Amino acid sequence: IIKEFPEVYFCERPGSFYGTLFTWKQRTPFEGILIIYSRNQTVMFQCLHNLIRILPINCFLKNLKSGSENFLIDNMAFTLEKELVTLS
Amino acid sequence: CLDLWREKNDRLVRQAKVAQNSGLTLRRQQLAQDALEGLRGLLHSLQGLPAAVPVLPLELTVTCNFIILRASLAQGFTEDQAQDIQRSLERVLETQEQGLRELWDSVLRASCLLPELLSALHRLVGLQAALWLSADRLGDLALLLETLNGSQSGASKDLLLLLKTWSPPAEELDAPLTLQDAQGLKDVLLTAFAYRQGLQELITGNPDKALSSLHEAASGLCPRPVLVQVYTALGSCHRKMGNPQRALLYLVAALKEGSAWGPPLLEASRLYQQLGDTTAELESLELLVEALNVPAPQFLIEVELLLPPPDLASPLHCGTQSQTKHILASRCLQTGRAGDAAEHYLDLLALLLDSSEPRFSPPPSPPGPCMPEVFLEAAVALIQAGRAQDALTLCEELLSRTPLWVSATHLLQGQA
Amino acid sequence: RVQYLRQIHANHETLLREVQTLRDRLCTEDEASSCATAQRLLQVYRQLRHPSLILL
Amino acid sequence: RRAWAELLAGRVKREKYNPERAQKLKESAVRLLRSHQDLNALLLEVEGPVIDCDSSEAYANHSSSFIGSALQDQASRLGVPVGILSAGMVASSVGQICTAPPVLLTVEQRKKLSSLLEFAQYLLAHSMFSRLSFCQELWKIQSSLLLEAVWHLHVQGIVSLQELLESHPDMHAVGSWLFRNLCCLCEQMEASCQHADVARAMLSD
Numbered sequence: 137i138i139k140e141f142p143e144v145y146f147c148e149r150p151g152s153f154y155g156t157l158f159t160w161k162q163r164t165p166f167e168g169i170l171i172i173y174s175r176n177q178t179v180m181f182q183c184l185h186n187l188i189r190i191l192p193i194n195c196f197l198k199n200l201k202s203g204s205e206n207f208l209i210d211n212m213a214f215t216l217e218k219e220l221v222t223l224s
Numbered sequence: 225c226l227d228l229w230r231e232k233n234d235r236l237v238r239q240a241k242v243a244q245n246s247g248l249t250l251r252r253q254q255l256a257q258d259a260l261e262g263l264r265g266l267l268h269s270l271q272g273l274p275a276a277v278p279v280l281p282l283e284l285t286v287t288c289n290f291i292i293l294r295a296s297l298a299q300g301f302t303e304d305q306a307q308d309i310q311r312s313l314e315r316v317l318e319t320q321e322q323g324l325r326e327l328w329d330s331v332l333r334a335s336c337l338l339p340e341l342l343s344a345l346h347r348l349v350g351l352q353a354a355l356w357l358s359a360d361r362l363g364d365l366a367l368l369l370e371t372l373n374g375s376q377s378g379a380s381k382d383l384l385l386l387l388k389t390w391s392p393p394a395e396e397l398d399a400p401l402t403l404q405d406a407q408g409l410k411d412v413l414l415t416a417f418a419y420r421q422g423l424q425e426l427i428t429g430n431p432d433k434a435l436s437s438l439h440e441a442a443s444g445l446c447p448r449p450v451l452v453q454v455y456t457a458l459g460s461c462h463r464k465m466g467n468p469q470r471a472l473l474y475l476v477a478a479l480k481e482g483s484a485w486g487p488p489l490l491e492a493s494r495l496y497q498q499l500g501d502t503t504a505e506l507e508s509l510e511l512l513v514e515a516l517n518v519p520a521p522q523f524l525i526e527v528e529l530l531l532p533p534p535d536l537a538s539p540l541h542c543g544t545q546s547q548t549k550h551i552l553a554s555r556c557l558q559t560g561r562a563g564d565a566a567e568h569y570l571d572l573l574a575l576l577l578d579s580s581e582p583r584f585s586p587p588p589s590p591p592g593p594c595m596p597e598v599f600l601e602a603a604v605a606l607i608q609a610g611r612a613q614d615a616l617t618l619c620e621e622l623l624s625r626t627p628l629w630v631s632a633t634h635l636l637q638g639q640a
Numbered sequence: 641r642v643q644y645l646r647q648i649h650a651n652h653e654t655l656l657r658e659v660q661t662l663r664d665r666l667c668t669e670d671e672a673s674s675c676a677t678a679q680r681l682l683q684v685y686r687q688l689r690h691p692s693l694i695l696l
Numbered sequence: 697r698r699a700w701a702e703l704l705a706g707r708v709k710r711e712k713y714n715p716e717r718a719q720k721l722k723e724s725a726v727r728l729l730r731s732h733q734d735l736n737a738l739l740l741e742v743e744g745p746v747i748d749c750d751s752s753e754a755y756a757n758h759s760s761s762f763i764g765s766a767l768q769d770q771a772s773r774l775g776v777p778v779g780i781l782s783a784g785m786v787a788s789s790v791g792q793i794c795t796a797p798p799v800l801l802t803v804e805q806r807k808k809l810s811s812l813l814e815f816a817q818y819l820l821a822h823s824m825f826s827r828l829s830f831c832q833e834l835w836k837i838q839s840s841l842l843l844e845a846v847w848h849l850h851v852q853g854i855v856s857l858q859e860l861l862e863s864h865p866d867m868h869a870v871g872s873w874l875f876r877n878l879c880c881l882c883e884q885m886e887a888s889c890q891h892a893d894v895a896r897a898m899l900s901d
Contacts, residue, residue, distance in 0.1 A: 164669070165442075206666075206673045210823055212681050213663050217820075219688075220656040221853070224649065469738045473775065476729045479722055480669070492729060504732055511725055518713040545710070574705030582709075614702060621699035657859070664827045667779035670726065 152182060169204060226278060229266055230400045233286055236262045237401040240293055244523045256297055256523060263290045271311070275319040277339065284344035285400045287312050291351060292403050296523050301358045309352060325364055328352070329371050342393040346372075347402070349390075350409030357417060357530050384421065384440065387414050404524050411445045416530035419450065426457060427537050431464040450527050452478045452488070453540055459491040460539035468499060486516045486542040493555070494539075502559055509552045516545050536589075546575050546585040550598070557601065562608030569602040596622070596629045603636045612640040655684055731832060731865075735784050738774055746770075748789055751781070758811075760818040767824060779826035782819050786812070787833035794840045799880045800891060801844050809845065813852045820854070831855060831863035838869070843877040847898040 138144050147156040157173040174180040188197060203211065236259040243255035263286060270276075270283050291305045306324070313327045320334050321327075335345050349372060356365045362383060369386035370378050377389060392406030422437035438461065441454040455478030462471035472495070478488040489512040496505035534541040542548070553568030576595070579585045588594060599622050606615040619637045623630075662680070665671030713721075739746055749755065751766045767785070771778040793808055794801065819825040834841065834855075849855045864870045878899075885895035 166448075205678070209673055209677055209681065210663070210666060212685075213659055213666070214821075214823070216659050216681070216684060217656070217663065220652050220659065223652050223688075224656065467741050469734065469741055472729050472733055476726050479726050479729070482722065485722060485725065489725060496732070499732075501732060504728065507728055508725075511721060511728070514710075514713070514717075514721055515725075517710050518715070518718050570703070570705045571707060573703065574708035578704055578708050617699040617702045621703060624699065657856070660827060660859075663823050664779065664825075664829075667823055667826050668777050668829065670723070 153179060156183065163206075169200075226282070229270065229279075230282060232262065232266055233282065233289065234401040236266075237289060237403060240289075240403060240523050253297070256293065260290070260293055260297070263293065275315060277319060280316060280319065280339075281341045281344055282400050283315065284312050284341065284348060285402060288344065288347055288351060289401075289403055292525055293523050295529065296521065296525065299521065300529065301355050303355075305351075306355055309348060309355075312348070324352075325367065328368050332371050343396045343399060343406075346390070346392050346406040347404075347409070350406050350413065351525075353413055354409065354525055354530055357413065357420075362417075383417050384414070384437070387417060409525060412525055412527050412530065414444050415441060415446055415450065415527055419454070419527075420532065422454075422457065423532075423538055423540070426461055426464070426539070427535065429464075431461040434458075434461045445527065447527060448481055449484060450531075452482050452484050455481075456487045456491050456539055459488065459495070463491065463495050463498060468495060471495060486512055486548075487540050489515055490542055491539050497555075506552070506556060506559070506561070509548070509555060512542075513545060513549055513552065516542065516548060536591075544586040546572065547588070547592075549575065550588075553605070554601075557605055557608075560608070562605050566602070566605030566609045566611065569598075569605050573598070573602055596626075600629060600632055600636065607636060607639055615640045655687070659684065730829070735774070735776070735781065738776070742774060746781075746785055746788060747792070748785065751785060760815060763815065764818070764822060764824060777826070778824050780829045782825050783827075783829035784833050786816060786819075786825075787830060787837060790834070790845065791837050791840045794837075794842055794845050799843045799877050799884060800895065801842055802891060802894070805844075809848060813848065813854060816854050817852070827855065827859065828863055831860050834860060835864045838873065843881060843898065844894075847901060850901065 138146065143159055143161065145158050145160075147153045147158070155175065156179060159171045160168060162168045172180055172183055174183065184197065188195070202208070239255055239262075240259045243252045243259070246252075247255070266286055267290060270279055270286065273279060276283075287308050291308060295301050295305060310324065310327070313324075313331055314321075316331055317327065317334065320337070331345070335342055349368065352368065353365055356362070366381055366383055366386060369383075369390055370380075373386065373389050377386060380386060380389075387410065390410060392410055396405055418437045418440040422434050422441060425431075425433040425437065435458065438454050438458050442451055446454065455474045459471045459475040459478065462468075462474065471491075475488050475491055475495075479485055482488065489508050492508035493505050493512065496502070496508055543551070549568060549572050553565050553572055556562075556565035556568055559565075575585045576598075588598070599618060603615045603618045606612070606618065615636060619633050619640075622633060659681070662671065662677065666673055666677065671677060735746060739750075748763065751770045752763055753766070756762070767778050767781050771781050774781070789812060793805055793812070796805075816825070846857070846860065849860070850857050861870050861874075881895055881899060885892040885899070
């Protein structure tokens with residue numbers, strides 16, 4: 137862990153992941169958001185493989201380009217709350 | 225030949241897993257007990273050779289795979305499995321007599337010679353530990369883990385320390401397959417033992433030792449049904465300490481992550497008496513009746529193997545529709561909303577006597593009052609309602625059917 | 641016309657008040673965030689985009 | 697024999713429920729466990745012995761983002777959602793305004809209430825505000841409240857008449873509550889032409 141930013145971790149495992157950076161935020165200790173900053177896109181794969189193997193069984197990975205599912209939904213609802221009010 | 229056996233195991237392991245993942249209720253069981261018998265026969269085949277240092281690793285590996293699959297299908301352990309462990313252990317020693325405890329001590333010294341099989345052995349210890357923790361043999365379990373670790377960890381008679389201090393030994397290099405490893409078990413044990421220590425300390429009236437283990441329960445493996453329990457339980461812990469608001473939250477959480485929401489609604493009823501919030505109490509139990517109307521396994525040691533069946537004294541104990549509907553009518557009648565208590569009682573009494581066609585409603589427990597006490601309670605509720613002709617019918621029926629209760633019968637017949 | 645904009649007004653005021661309660665269920669984790677929310681809102685969207693802003 | 701036929705309860709059959717009914721059940725259950733919740737007690741439980749003062753730390757500033765991050769920190773201590781705190785803390789600061797001295801409250805009440813409500817809209821825009829935890833925490837007050845306050849709620853779009861009154865347990869208590877407020881109003885609106893303008897506005901509303 138970096139102390140100054142302890143929502144971040146640096147891999148020190150001495151092979152092919154070395155210096156890969158992760159972060160983990162839990163929310164609803166079922167659901168959680170991993171971010172992977174890797175040195176190529178191979179090493180991004182080798183990671184999710186090593187980890188879909190140590191997860192539990194129904195562990196529904198799924199890729200975010202464009203904002204967490206929760207946030208998007210508020211951002212949507214918002215832009216109606218305003219639209220419909222404006223249309224009223 | 226070792227090749228072939230290794231091969232057959234691995235094959236059977238994958239067969240087992242495929243049945244688990246996939247399949248129908250029938251076809252699952254077909255392939256399961258198929259692979260079971262396969263493992264038997266491979267067991268018997270190796271059980272037929274003398275000792276064999278190179279075979280041991282697989283031997284122990286194999287039998288584990290069995291016990292696991294055996295016990296998991298059975299949905300419960302037995303002592304045949306302890307004998308299987310006894311056998312394999314005796315073999316280990318025959319390479320290099322009395323009872324399990326000296327065997328293990330002599331075993332772990334023979335393994336501290338570092339023959340490379342430790343990957344299985346700690347695995348066996350997890351198993352041994354699953355049995356003994358199903359069997360409440362925690363003195364010996366502690367004892368095994370003390371010889372396992374340094375015997376310097378000999379003063380440390382807490383389990384929850386020893387289980388953590390125990391390191392499963394290897395990343396478990398390219399071996400014959402298994403269904404489960406020391407880690408994946410070690411992790412079931414911490415959560416199971418902790419869960420049990422917790423309910424013990426709660427009922428035994430230490431709702432301060434409890435909260436430590438009941439949060440060690442949610443943390444490390446905790447399948448969600450295990451959690452709904454942890455949470456109803458902390459709802460009691462705090463109700464007992466006099467923290468109704470801290471309790472309430474853990475109970476709402478248990479509701480949502482709930483598939484199993486009788487026991488929380490029960491803990492709420494017990495909380496709304498304790499504050500006296502009587503309309504709320506009665507409502508939490510009405511909802512409970514409807515929550516006990518509406519209603520899958522794995523070939524691997526779950527946490528639900530090493531959970532007990534519940535005592536009567538626990539916050540997790542919920543009776544059945546009939547018992548609970550009586551508690552509601554009972555808790556209604558003590559309040560004096562007797563018209564409504566009577567309605568509850570005539571739905572109780574119908575579910576006890578009219579029930580001929582469906583599954584038989586569960587009978588009242590010996591500590592609780594018998595059938596006749598209940599007929600009279602019904603009649604009383606009826607009086608309080610002002611349903612007197614109907615109370616007469618109840619009493620006439622009871623006398624037609626068959627002490628204190630007869631004298632009382634006459635009395636309520638008079639009051640009618 | 642007037643009849644017109646009121647038919648539109650009632651058809652709006654339901655959609656808003658629905659969404660409003662939906663937001664609160666997203667605040668308190670009462671509903672679920674996952675979906676049915678996702679696919680209900682994208683249906684609210686689809687309702688209105690049809691004769692969006694007749695410009696007169 | 698007649699005894700039997702009379703005892704024979706018709707409603708002795710309860711079938712396995714539709715999994716929809718199970719969620720309705722779990723919702724009416726969480727509704728119940730929260731309707732009997734209080735926060736003041738929670739703060740005395742988790743924290744040792746609540747207003748904007750408490751969360752903002754005794755008049756620190758009145759900046760909107762700042763007070764929002766204060767509700768985040770409060771909710772972090774308690775482990776209650778931020779919406780729930782904010783609903784309660786506003787309903788509490790509502791009690792404050794409407795108590796300090798008849799249906800209208802027309803001076804300076806209007807000013808503090810507008811500053812309050814312009815913060816409530818900030819809350820509603822970041823969605824830091826369970827509306828229905830708010831409806832319930834108003835009918836916990838129910839008496840301090842005046843029809844003027846509720847009509848500003850309606851028009852500033854914090855609640856609507858219909859969303860409040862359709863989250864009150866006793867429909868009689870709402871009926872009698874309004875009946876009193878409307879009677880006192882129609883008594884009013886001859887007291888002055890200024891007060892009558894605002895009164896005629898909310899009465900038509």
